[PDB]
Amino acid sequence: ATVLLEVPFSARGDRIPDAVAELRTREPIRKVRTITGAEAWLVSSYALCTQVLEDRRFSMKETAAAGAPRLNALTVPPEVVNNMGNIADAGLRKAVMKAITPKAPGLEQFLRDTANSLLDNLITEGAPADLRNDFADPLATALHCKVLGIPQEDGPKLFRSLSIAFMSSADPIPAAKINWDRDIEYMAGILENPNITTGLMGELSRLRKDPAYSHVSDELFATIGVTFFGAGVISTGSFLTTALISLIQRPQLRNLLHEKPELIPAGVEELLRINLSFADGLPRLATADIQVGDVLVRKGELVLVLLEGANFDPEHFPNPGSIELDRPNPTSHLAFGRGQHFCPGSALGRRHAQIGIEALLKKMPGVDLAVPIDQLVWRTRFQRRIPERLPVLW
Ligand code: HEM
Ligand SMILES: O=C1N[C@@H](Cc2c[nH]c3ccccc23)C(=O)N[C@H]1Cc1ccc(O)cc1
């Protein structure tokens, strides 16, 4: 006898397990057990993943309900699971989007200058260089301090909450509450700081004193700063790091993008499509009995939308494991989700990766791993798949 199939399958972000294609072909919706011991429905085909993400009766908000089957323990207060919904209800959605667009004056130049300075420092120090700790993550942190309008010197401390805040744990994490409360106090101070007049926090500070937003809570304003810094920095730093591995493992593509940097945006879209940065399926709780393929999902059950299940589906993306720059449906992947909860930082994440890759290929055209690929150490029980260090030479 064997136990019910457990998720996640592997923390490695450099290869997709053969099990994904097996489940997609044989049982594209099937029962699994999560790290908490709960049962869930794992969805692995493009058609069924899109159906779940486009039906709001599969609720993100309701995954925080007490007594629900859980993918993992909350690392934020339960109301914060519905963060975007709370922002929209407060009439702040348009202002938040305008603040996080990569089109802001001087933002792209700031990204280029920061990426170039980090790379120059690595070249001065000499090989090996760690592209996660000394490139991708500081570039993501610097970008988010600029987008938020907060001091660059405050970035490293806010960043150090992330290795705990984005854990995917069976049980509550005491350190996550200590760091959450401290980071909220910091953002509350930023709202009261007269020097903070630019970026997302400068805009929220002004809207907070506008009569049209007098009843929006101070708790929500501080929460927007903590959540957008954390989600943006963990997502951009982790995606860029794993996209750099995908590129280093494809020297023909690396050489083509070095030669023709105008192809970098199409290259980043394929790197997003094949990305294995999300460690778990996206969770949703059914609020009704809903038919998904051969399964009638019952009200109160947990559904997990496996992004790599959809993104590597050959019925939607033929030769799914290959980076092809001329696909006819290039942005139809689910790397940023789909539907009600589609990533609000999609344009900024694309620009962060495009500029980081453009700068790296110009400065280090001979970039290569400095250790055999199996020697990368993959972070476990985390909401993202990332190597602890990414040692390279050039
Ligand atoms: C490469 C970069 C990024 C990737 C791959 C990524 C991916 C995703 C995905 C897949 C979702 C959907 C989650 C779901 O439906 O359960 C999401 C949501 C979200 N992301 Fe991103 N993200 C990235 C960058 C960012 C950035 C830069 C920010 C903010 C500065 C951000 C803020 C958020 C927030 C707040 C949500 C929740 C939206 C909602 O509930 O409506 N993301 N992201
Ligand atoms: O469940 C998630 N799902 C995805 C999407 C998401 C869902 N709800 C969110 C609220 C705020 C920011 C992001 C989200 C994610 O990026 N993060 C986590 C939420 C999160 C946010 C901030 C933390 O310190 C810890 C956890």
Over the range 244-256, which residues count as b (16 or more CB within 10 Å of their CB) and which as e? bbbbbebeebbee
C-alpha 393 to ligand 1 mean position (Å): 31
Ligand nearest to the CA of 306: 1
Amino acid at 322: S
The domains found in the chain, sorted by start residue, are 1-394 (1.10.630.10)
Contact 191, 221 (CB under 8 A): yes
Of 243, 222, 235, the residue nearest 345 (C-alpha): 235
Q: Which residues contact 82 (CB under 8 A, 6 or more apart)?
A: 60, 61, 64
Q: Which residues contact 8 (CB under 8 A, 6 or more apart)?
A: 168, 279, 280
Query: Which single residue is written with the structure tokens 């453009």?
Result: 358
Q: Report the distance separating Cα 363 and Cα 320, nearest Å.
A: 30
Ligand nearest to the CA of 162: 2
Of 340, 142, 360, 148, the residue nearest 268 (C-alpha): 360
The best mutation among 167, 383, 385, 386 to test binding of ligand 2, ranked by most ligand atoms within 8 Å of the C-beta, falls on: 383
Contact 142, 135 (CB under 8 A): no
Measured from CB, residues less than 6 Å from any atom of ligand 2 are 75-76, 81, 83, 165-166, 227, 230-231, 235
Contact 207, 95 (CB under 8 A): yes
* Annotated binding residue 260: no
Atom of ligand 1 at shortest distance to CA of 341?
41
Please, which experimental method was used?
A: X-ray
The best mutation among 83, 86, 186, 226 to test binding of ligand 2, ranked by most ligand atoms within 8 Å of the C-beta, falls on: 83
What CA–CA distances, in Å, run from 143 to 101, 107, 301? 12, 8, 38
Amino acid at 351: R
Q: Report the distance separating Cα 295 and Cα 302, nearest Å.
A: 13
* Annotated binding residue 341: yes
Q: Report the distance separating Cα 141 and Cα 152, nearest Å.
A: 8
Beta strands in the chain (DSSP E): 29-33, 39-43, 58-59, 129-130, 282-286, 290-292, 295-297, 302-305, 368-369, 391-393
- Rg (Cα) of the chain, in Å, rounded? 21
**CB-based burial label for 133 (10 Å; 0-12, 13-18, 19+):** middle
Tokens linked to 241: 């790091």
- DSSP class of residue 103? T
What CA–CA distances, in Å, run from 376 to 1, 243, 392? 34, 14, 11
Measured in angstroms, the resolution is 1.4
